[PDB]
Design a protein around this ligand. Structure first.
Ligand SMILES: [K+]
Length: 153
Protein backbone atom coordinates (compact mmCIF):
# COMPACT_ATOMS: atom_id res chain seq x y z
CA UNK A 1 0.00 0.00 0.00
CA UNK A 2 1.45 3.33 1.16
CA UNK A 3 4.77 3.57 3.01
CA UNK A 4 4.98 6.13 5.85
CA UNK A 5 7.44 8.99 5.96
CA UNK A 6 11.04 8.10 6.90
CA UNK A 7 10.26 4.58 5.69
CA UNK A 8 10.48 6.07 2.17
CA UNK A 9 14.21 6.74 2.55
CA UNK A 10 16.60 3.94 1.65
CA UNK A 11 16.97 1.26 4.36
CA UNK A 12 20.59 2.25 5.00
CA UNK A 13 19.25 5.48 6.51
CA UNK A 14 16.66 3.81 8.76
CA UNK A 15 17.42 4.54 12.39
CA UNK A 16 16.73 2.03 15.12
CA UNK A 17 13.50 3.95 15.74
CA UNK A 18 12.68 3.72 12.02
CA UNK A 19 13.14 -0.06 12.07
CA UNK A 20 10.61 -0.40 14.89
CA UNK A 21 8.24 1.86 12.94
CA UNK A 22 8.79 -0.33 9.87
CA UNK A 23 7.83 -3.43 11.86
CA UNK A 24 4.67 -1.67 13.05
CA UNK A 25 3.77 -0.63 9.49
CA UNK A 26 4.31 -4.14 8.11
CA UNK A 27 2.29 -5.68 10.95
CA UNK A 28 -0.73 -3.48 10.22
CA UNK A 29 -0.40 -3.55 6.44
CA UNK A 30 0.01 -7.33 6.11
CA UNK A 31 -2.10 -8.46 9.12
CA UNK A 32 0.87 -10.19 10.70
CA UNK A 33 0.94 -11.74 14.15
CA UNK A 34 2.02 -9.15 16.76
CA UNK A 35 5.74 -8.42 16.40
CA UNK A 36 7.53 -7.38 19.57
CA UNK A 37 9.33 -4.09 18.94
CA UNK A 38 12.47 -5.35 20.70
CA UNK A 39 12.86 -8.13 18.14
CA UNK A 40 15.16 -6.14 15.88
CA UNK A 41 17.26 -3.78 18.05
CA UNK A 42 19.41 -2.37 15.26
CA UNK A 43 19.29 0.26 12.55
CA UNK A 44 18.56 -0.23 8.85
CA UNK A 45 22.16 -1.02 7.95
CA UNK A 46 22.30 -3.99 10.32
CA UNK A 47 18.92 -5.12 9.12
CA UNK A 48 20.27 -5.50 5.63
CA UNK A 49 22.96 -7.93 6.85
CA UNK A 50 20.61 -10.46 8.48
CA UNK A 51 19.98 -13.62 6.47
CA UNK A 52 16.50 -14.95 5.80
CA UNK A 53 17.21 -17.61 8.42
CA UNK A 54 18.00 -14.82 10.90
CA UNK A 55 14.63 -13.16 10.22
CA UNK A 56 12.88 -16.50 10.80
CA UNK A 57 14.72 -17.05 14.08
CA UNK A 58 13.75 -13.59 15.33
CA UNK A 59 10.17 -13.74 13.98
CA UNK A 60 8.97 -17.30 13.34
CA UNK A 61 5.54 -16.01 12.31
CA UNK A 62 6.63 -13.30 9.89
CA UNK A 63 10.42 -13.33 9.45
CA UNK A 64 10.42 -14.62 5.88
CA UNK A 65 7.75 -12.07 4.91
CA UNK A 66 9.75 -9.20 6.44
CA UNK A 67 12.93 -10.33 4.68
CA UNK A 68 11.27 -10.43 1.25
CA UNK A 69 9.67 -7.04 1.82
CA UNK A 70 12.92 -5.38 2.93
CA UNK A 71 15.26 -7.14 0.50
CA UNK A 72 13.25 -7.57 -2.67
CA UNK A 73 10.49 -4.91 -2.52
CA UNK A 74 11.90 -1.97 -0.52
CA UNK A 75 15.32 -2.06 -2.22
CA UNK A 76 17.29 -3.90 0.45
CA UNK A 77 19.21 -6.06 -2.03
CA UNK A 78 21.04 -3.22 -3.77
CA UNK A 79 21.74 -1.49 -0.46
CA UNK A 80 23.24 -4.67 0.96
CA UNK A 81 25.44 -4.85 -2.14
CA UNK A 82 26.70 -1.26 -1.85
CA UNK A 83 27.37 -1.82 1.85
CA UNK A 84 29.36 -4.97 1.16
CA UNK A 85 31.37 -3.13 -1.52
CA UNK A 86 32.02 -0.18 0.80
CA UNK A 87 33.06 -2.47 3.65
CA UNK A 88 35.24 -4.74 1.48
CA UNK A 89 37.27 -1.86 -0.01
CA UNK A 90 38.58 0.44 2.73
CA UNK A 91 38.72 4.05 1.61
CA UNK A 92 35.79 3.71 -0.80
CA UNK A 93 33.02 6.25 -0.44
CA UNK A 94 29.37 5.24 -0.42
CA UNK A 95 28.79 7.13 -3.67
CA UNK A 96 31.80 5.41 -5.25
CA UNK A 97 30.46 1.99 -4.23
CA UNK A 98 27.13 2.71 -5.95
CA UNK A 99 28.99 3.89 -9.06
CA UNK A 100 31.12 0.73 -9.26
CA UNK A 101 28.19 -1.64 -8.77
CA UNK A 102 26.31 0.12 -11.56
CA UNK A 103 29.39 -0.15 -13.78
CA UNK A 104 29.43 -3.95 -13.32
CA UNK A 105 25.72 -4.71 -13.34
CA UNK A 106 25.24 -5.48 -9.70
CA UNK A 107 28.18 -7.82 -9.75
CA UNK A 108 29.56 -7.35 -6.32
CA UNK A 109 32.64 -9.44 -7.05
CA UNK A 110 33.68 -7.45 -10.13
CA UNK A 111 32.93 -4.13 -8.43
CA UNK A 112 35.13 -4.96 -5.42
CA UNK A 113 38.04 -6.05 -7.63
CA UNK A 114 37.69 -2.95 -9.81
CA UNK A 115 37.79 -0.69 -6.75
CA UNK A 116 40.71 -2.60 -5.22
CA UNK A 117 42.81 -1.89 -8.33
CA UNK A 118 41.75 1.77 -8.16
CA UNK A 119 42.69 2.06 -4.48
CA UNK A 120 46.09 0.39 -4.85
CA UNK A 121 46.84 2.39 -8.01
CA UNK A 122 46.21 5.51 -5.93
CA UNK A 123 49.04 4.70 -3.49
CA UNK A 124 52.02 5.15 -5.84
CA UNK A 125 53.24 6.02 -9.33
CA UNK A 126 52.93 2.36 -10.36
CA UNK A 127 50.73 1.52 -13.34
CA UNK A 128 47.35 -0.19 -13.23
CA UNK A 129 48.93 -3.42 -14.50
CA UNK A 130 51.49 -3.15 -11.68
CA UNK A 131 48.65 -2.73 -9.17
CA UNK A 132 46.90 -5.75 -10.68
CA UNK A 133 50.13 -7.74 -10.30
CA UNK A 134 50.44 -7.00 -6.58
CA UNK A 135 46.74 -7.69 -5.93
CA UNK A 136 46.81 -11.02 -7.77
CA UNK A 137 50.12 -11.79 -6.05
CA UNK A 138 48.47 -11.16 -2.67
CA UNK A 139 45.20 -12.99 -3.46
CA UNK A 140 43.34 -9.66 -3.76
CA UNK A 141 43.96 -8.77 -0.11
CA UNK A 142 44.01 -4.99 -0.51
CA UNK A 143 45.48 -4.52 2.98
CA UNK A 144 48.53 -6.70 2.29
CA UNK A 145 48.88 -5.43 -1.28
CA UNK A 146 48.91 -1.88 0.07
CA UNK A 147 51.53 -2.71 2.70
CA UNK A 148 53.73 -4.35 0.06
CA UNK A 149 53.96 -1.12 -1.91
CA UNK A 150 54.22 1.03 1.22
CA UNK A 151 57.06 -1.01 2.76
CA UNK A 152 59.37 -1.32 -0.27
CA UNK A 153 63.10 -0.74 0.45
K1 LIG B 1 36.67 2.23 -14.20
Amino acid sequence: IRLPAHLRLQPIYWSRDDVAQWLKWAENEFSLSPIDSNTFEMNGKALLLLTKEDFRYRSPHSGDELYELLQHILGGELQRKIMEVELSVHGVTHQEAQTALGATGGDVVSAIRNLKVDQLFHLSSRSRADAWRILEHYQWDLSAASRYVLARP
